[PDB]
Amino acid sequence: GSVVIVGRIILSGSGSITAYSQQTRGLLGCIITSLTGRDKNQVEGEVQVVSTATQSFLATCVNGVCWTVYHGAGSKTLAGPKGPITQMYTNVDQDLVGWQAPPGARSLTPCTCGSSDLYLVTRHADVIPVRRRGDSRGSLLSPRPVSYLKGSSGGPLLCPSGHAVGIFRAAVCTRGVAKAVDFVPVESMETTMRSPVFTDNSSPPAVPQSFQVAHLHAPTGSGKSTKVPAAYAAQGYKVLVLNPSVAATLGFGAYMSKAHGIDPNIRTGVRTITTGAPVTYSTYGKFLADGGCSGGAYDIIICDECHSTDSTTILGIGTVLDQAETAGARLVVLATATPPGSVTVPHPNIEEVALSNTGEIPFYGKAIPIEAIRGGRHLIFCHSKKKCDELAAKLSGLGINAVAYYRGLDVSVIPTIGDVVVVATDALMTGYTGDFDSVIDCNTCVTQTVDFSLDPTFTIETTTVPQDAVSRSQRRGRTGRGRRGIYRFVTPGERPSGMFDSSVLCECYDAGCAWYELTPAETSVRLRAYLNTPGLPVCQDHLEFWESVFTGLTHIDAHFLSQTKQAGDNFPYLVAYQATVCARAQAPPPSWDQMWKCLIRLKPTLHGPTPLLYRLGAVQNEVTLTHPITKYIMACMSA
């Protein structure tokens, strides 16, 4: 689907800065236009009201380029007269994207006066005075609730003369009140428009003399983890190769022994081998467990699957970026098949067939014909363990050799040879390396989001979301490996890649405390190195907030920490910490869900309201907001 112009904000060309909205399309015209990518409507004005099916925001024409926010548009095309217009610019680090404006259309020009008295144009066509405080910051003269500014991103920041100062990107807000605005400066778009549109990162970089951070954007079939380290090693270099998966790590070592005749050093929690070879294959977790970089150990560190937004990868890459120069490394290679802002393109070996309602197996509102899976090795992706169980049971009833695989299950469940239908969650890609005849994708995943809810503090909620380009690629990538494959899907609608939630940062401080004997200040240092490095997945800088939160979570119960860590669920430090305050109060947990099992044995001795620190799921008990830790966490929000 394309981004559709559904209206426009008309700015006054004389006197005071005033604006008015003019709708040009309704929901029907907007949906039709999104599907076709053809918009024959005359585009007028500098500020556009744009829409996707799920979202609405603004776009501004400055110097012939129609600009918007990456968070709203993603890598989507813009519906135009001749059909879909492809993005000319996509800068995930600045959250800015730009399409070539349909010829004739009016543009704003950059401001020359250097004024600090600014005017933000909203989707409501209101002109809000802003005082410039920095390069990308300006303070609202009168604070507005956050909800007032929703849908105004991509809107312009004007000077008194009506020229462009920047594009509205984010709201600087405390407890749901916006007091300042964050914007992309116009001079940044002027730099972008002056520079090369295409960049090359398909071939590995040559080893420089000074320390350097390089990007490697090559397909899974380029051997970023095999051919590339082998090649560097043949050149006589010390190489460390990091990956999120144990299975991937071991398998690449097993490949290098059989194929390239080198027996590498292997470092995983399960298996460690030390041969003294010039190549080491390690997981990010083992690398973090080991204490990260040790002096003069490696020349080149390859961070494979650097698009991965799991807390271990973020913390691992962050560690590499903070320590590598110091430990005498000359090159850091951020390698990935799917960099941020990626658009899934067809694969020559993979036939893609949309799932219809013609079939004997119900699957996500659609159907799977029994012929597509009867005989052969097939992988079906489900968003949850529940769905896996149901689907594998339905298939076993139909005489199909079906197996469910998810977190907490052994990889032996998957037969390595016979006819099989593997029904799995994303847990498969880090647990098993095998490939299949066909892949059936539900096109949905499960994500954790942080909500600064103030009931009393924050909430970490698990949500079902449409898959992004990375998810679609990793999943589809299970088939068509050096042979022909089939990929069947429920929907083609993908979400923008390269962005992650603040709850992922919270997981990094959690892991740092629970597993890596890292103080919140050490973790911040490591994540800062990741944040300040361009070309990696992006996130809101909540580093100081999370650091402050964890800094106060002192004197956790060691026994609860041990249990939560072993159970393997999300948040072992926060769960153990909430249990610690409960146990010490002889108070029951927020609920009796599996999350709070470490308290089951104490159940007959637990009474009263819960000293609630934060919300990690449903709270079925009465709560008390009087605990000093709750007051501490509340004080962290109001900074």
Place this chain on the structure above:
Amino acid sequence: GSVVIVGRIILSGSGSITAYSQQTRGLLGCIITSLTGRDKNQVEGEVQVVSTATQSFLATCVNGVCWTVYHGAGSKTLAGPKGPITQMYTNVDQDLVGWQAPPGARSLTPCTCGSSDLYLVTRHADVIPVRRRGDSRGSLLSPRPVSYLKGSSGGPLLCPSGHAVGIFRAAVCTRGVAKAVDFVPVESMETTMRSPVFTDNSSPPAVPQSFQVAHLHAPTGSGKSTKVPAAYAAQGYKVLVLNPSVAATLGFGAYMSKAHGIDPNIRTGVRTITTGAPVTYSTYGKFLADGGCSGGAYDIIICDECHSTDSTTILGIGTVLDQAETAGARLVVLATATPPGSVTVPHPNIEEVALSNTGEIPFYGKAIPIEAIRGGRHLIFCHSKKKCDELAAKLSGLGINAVAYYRGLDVSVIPTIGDVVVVATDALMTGYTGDFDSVIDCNTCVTQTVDFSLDPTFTIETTTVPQDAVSRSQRRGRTGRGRRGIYRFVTPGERPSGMFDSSVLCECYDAGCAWYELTPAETSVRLRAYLNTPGLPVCQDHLEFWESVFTGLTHIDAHFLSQTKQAGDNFPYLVAYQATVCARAQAPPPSWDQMWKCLIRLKPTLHGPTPLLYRLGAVQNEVTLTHPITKYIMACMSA
């Protein structure tokens, strides 16, 4: 737009109760079908997945009728083979709506076994066990979060034999956790299947021997406030006529004097006239101020505009319904042009013209041609005081004679003779009597909603919503009275009439305390009489909750109460009480917005966090959730 079948939930006919979902339409087909009302698709199954543009829910086929919830479907038609199917049944009191099922619809049959082990079918095709506890209630064996059950209303409650027990209507929940389900019993559906096709009450009821509550559903201008009381008075009865508007109340005294030859008693806060006549015209407010019903004063009480969901009307009607029998009244007449579940029908002397983008005056994304309003008397409805000011200023710049009118302005602003463009909010409806050449409607209104947000307690937020059938009728009704009128609109979309928010109940307890020297217990009594009376607008029974809240708001500062009451804003009791808590704890208000003007004489003394009781707007200051009143309000939320 029509309600569209977008999918189906397929139930097992053998063994254990299992279900699966099957989508039949995408967003495009759904939107097209909604517009046309034509659905040629085959209707397989008993449970349907239905959708409007804004909402999705379920519908179940029972005894040839396809049933759903009023809150979901309103009075909307269902898209069918021959075009839009009009509702056969609309019972707002039960929240049940029914259309005649198309061919192919296999209907479930009512349960005969009388089992208490029930099974709720969700939109996620999950079969949830429920234990029947009453006629319309059942408890969930394992509590589920509220968000899990959203979109499942109109879904069936099945017995172990797969028969229909009732349809899922509402969730019984505490702090966002659903612990029980409220359902329409299947027997109450056959009671609806009995209800008349016309239900005639277009004519006033004859006075009965015993006390009775009658409904009068007649058009505006049909003399429900004039001919009907005069007719009863001629028979020798004492008549009280109640209205929400002072302007209407005064107006009726002039018409009745000149036309029906009766100089009536007039009772308003502004003006009271006592002639000793057998007819009295009073506002609901004055009636409440007077102490309500006094013994043997009236024989007939007419509650005009009984569709009005303002706190005064609800409290006024409630007072009448609780006191009338006792005070010796023989008849209570609930009169309205727009009863709950009303659908706006064409008016014979009103030409309706959709606004386009062809015009010189911007108006809500559309445009007003200057010729439509230059000369003549016109009324333009805006959703806010802000929009009125802007529009009246834009028109005055174009040499038009424009005037803005809203709450807190004197009605003298409107010229009674002369070319004029009145730019007004719904405040006009109660302030001004008159008729216009044309009406231009923005089709949106402002409503207050209560959010049980737990940050720490509840929130009363102002929101913009699409207008309902009552709003559209009252607004359009300002033209076409005794002369050809024109009605111009932004959108045809109208939401369901006859339902109101729990914050309206909160306003009743507020008014009871602030103005009517009514204890929370007295208010509850009066509102219960309104709730338990069928045929009136419906609401969630939160009387005990609000009563308990206000009961704890003890020893308010009389001076703050006086100040808030005099300013004329929304919750004078809640504002004054929060100020009282601030002044006493010597802390600043939640913000320095006009809402907290009363605490200005204390601005230098008050410092620290705010002892926050509830949220009435934006909170810019630090908060403390330790105040005993906050803990009291929090304890009230638990049931």
